[PDB]
């Protein structure tokens, strides 16, 4: 009984051992907008007559 | 077609992880199971006929 308490703590140790880690990589990433027209910022002048 | 067959059960193995202490906790429960863990004397001579 004691050994089996001895051989659990043991095995509790080598258990603490990690394996890697995750994350995700987005920093620097902006989300784009569309824009669906295009400004001219163009009027006409023209006199009454034409001319 | 006939074969004998000895079942001493099914054990799991983690790997990535010392063999060793894994083996030491199963060595504990396999004993239990023979009824071997404590102080023992065998009597099987009575077991007989004739």
Known sequence: ?51 | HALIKEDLGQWPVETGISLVNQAGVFAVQLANKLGIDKPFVLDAGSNYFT
């Not at chain 1, 009984?1 to 001895?6: L, N, S």
């Not at chain 1, 509790?12 to 620097?28: C, H, I, P, Q």
């Open chain 1, 1 to 51: 009984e004691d050994m089996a308490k001895i051989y659990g703590a043991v095995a509790a140790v080598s258990k603490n051992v990690n394996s890697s880690v995750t994350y995700e990589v987005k920093r620097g990433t902006h989300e784009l907008i569309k824009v669906p027209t295009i400004p001219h910022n163009l009027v006409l002048i023209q006199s009454d007559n034409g001319k």
